[PDB]
């Protein structure tokens, strides 16, 4: 079997490169009986149309940002990045693999002719801040660069003042005082960009943005495989997932070490209690999204049940 998968990332991009692990491990684990051809974003079709292309047989799968499909159903946006839910990728991965998330993903994408194989992420983002934030209360009044939608709405619910800016304007806007803090990227990027130098109170691990990248394929083709090959492909995906998370973690740790060694940057790790408080604020916004569709309510119910059960949110 030879299956062509389209990525949401371009050639060159470090996450695209990490995705080679999925293809390589599928070939290794199946001793060649299944091969994956990994294609950069836009090779065969538009990044928002990969589901269509998969069910049609034009490509066989994708590795992509599930938030791209929020237009189909708000549930997609909510499950892809339930702002504030996670303090580490392991939490989200456990939610998917053992807490009902994978079943939700298949309920969402089987109707499009896709089988959800497994989850990955480009990383839990770190927060950029010029002002010292150790509690949720510290967010009140802070001008925070926030993407439109659930991220901005959660920061507003926390009493912050969201500001809408392109990524390329964040650095100068901090310097000029237009913003005091920002959503940007993972710590290693924030650090490399000089963000933490001009805004010397980052929060790491971050507390608000952890995007879900799905690995999914044509469900008819999936269903035609033997159990042992399905298990090997799921295994390959898990290996890719773990290699990606560990690689991201190491790069962040490198950057944090450099930040701390300079003696000026204070890296704040919010307590479990403060993170649980942030979940509670965010939950009010998740619930608004939950009311927008049946599947969004199901995502909300499953997520909140998981968080309460794990002691991550007030019972």
Give me the residues that bind Zn ion (CB under 5 A), please: 125, 134-135, 138, 183, 192, 197, 209, 246, 249, 257, 269, 273-274, 309
Nearer to Zn ion, 294 or 310 (CB): 310
CB contact at 8 A, 26 and 36? yes
**Region of residue 100 (phi > 0: left; psi between -120 and 50: alpha; otherwise: beta):** left
Which residue, 110 or 271, has its beta carbon nearer to Zn ion?
271
Retrieve residue 234's tokens.
């799921």
Nearest C-alpha neighbor of 251 from the set 124, 130, 132: 124
**Closer residue to Zn ion in complex, CB, 30/51:** 30
Minimal distance in Å, beta carbon 132 to Zn ion? 6
User: Helix-strand-coil percent breakdown of the chain, rounded to 5?
Assistant: 50, 15, 35
Q: Are 115 and 218 in contact (CB under 8 A)?
A: yes
Pairing status of strand 114-120 against strand 143-145: unpaired
- Closer CB to Zn ion, 118 or 200, in the complex: 200
Closer residue to Zn ion, CB minimum distance, 20 or 308:
308
Which of helix, strand or coil describes residue 35?
A: strand
- Residue facing Zn ion at closest CB distance: 197
Q: Identify the CA nearest to 5 among candidates 248, 214, 223.
A: 214
Residue 232 or 249: the one with the smaller Cβ distance to Zn ion is 249
Q: Shortest Cβ distance from residue 63 to Zn ion (Å)?
A: 19
Q: Closest approach of Cβ 42 to Zn ion, in Å?
A: 22
- Tell me if 125 sits within 8 A of 195, measured CB to CB: no
* Closest CB 308 distance from Zn ion, rounded Å: 9
What secondary structure letter does DSSP report for 124?
A: P
Which is closer to Zn ion, CB of 99 or CB of 118? Answer: 99
Calpha distance 248→124 (Å, rounded): 9
CB 136 within 8 A of CB 277: yes
Nearest distance from C-beta of residue 209 to Zn ion, angstroms = 5
For residue 31, the minimal CB distance to Zn ion (Å) is 13
Least Cβ distance, residue 137 to Zn ion (angstroms): 7
């Amino acid at each position: 079997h030879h299956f062509r998968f389209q990525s949401s990332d371009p050639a060159g991009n470090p996450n695209f490169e990490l995705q080679h692990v999925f293809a390589d491990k599928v070939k290794e684990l199946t001793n060649g009986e299944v091969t994956i051809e990994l294609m950069p974003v836009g090779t065969i079709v538009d990044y928002k149309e990969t589901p269509d292309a998969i069910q049609a047989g034009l490509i066989d799968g994708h590795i992509t940002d599930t938030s791209y499909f929020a237009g189909r159903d708000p549930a997609f946006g909510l499950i892809a990045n339930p702002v504030g839910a996670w303090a580490d990728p392991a939490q989200m991965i456990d939610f998917v693999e053992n807490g009902g998330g994978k079943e939700l993903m298949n309920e969402l994408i089987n109707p499009y002719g896709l089988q959800f194989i497994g989850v990955s992420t480009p990383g839990l983002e770190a927060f950029v801040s010029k002002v010292p934030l150790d509690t949720v209360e510290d967010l009140k009044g802070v001008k925070v660069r926030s993407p439109e939608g659930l991220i901005a709405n959660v920061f507003a619910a926390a009493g912050a003042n969201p500001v809408n800016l392109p990524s390329s304007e964040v650095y100068t806007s901090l310097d000029k005082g237009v913003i005091d803090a920002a959503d940007y990227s993972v710590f290693s990027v924030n650090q490399d960009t000089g963000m933490n130098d001009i805004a010397p109170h980052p929060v790491y691990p971050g507390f608000h943005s952890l995007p879900l990248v799905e690995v999914s394929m044509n469900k008819q083709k999936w269903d035609a495989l033997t159990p042992e090959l399905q298990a090997k492909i799921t295994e390959a995906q898990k290996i890719f997932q773990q290699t990606q998370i560990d690689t991201l973690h190491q790069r962040d740790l490198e950057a944090v070490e450099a930040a701390k060694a300079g003696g000026k940057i204070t890296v704040h790790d919010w307590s479990d209690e403060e993170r649980a408080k942030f979940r509670g604020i965010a939950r009010g916004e998740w619930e608004k999204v939950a009311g927008q569709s049946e599947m969004a309510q199901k995502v909300y119910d499953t997520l909140v049940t998981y968080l309460k059960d794990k002691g991550l949110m007030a019972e």
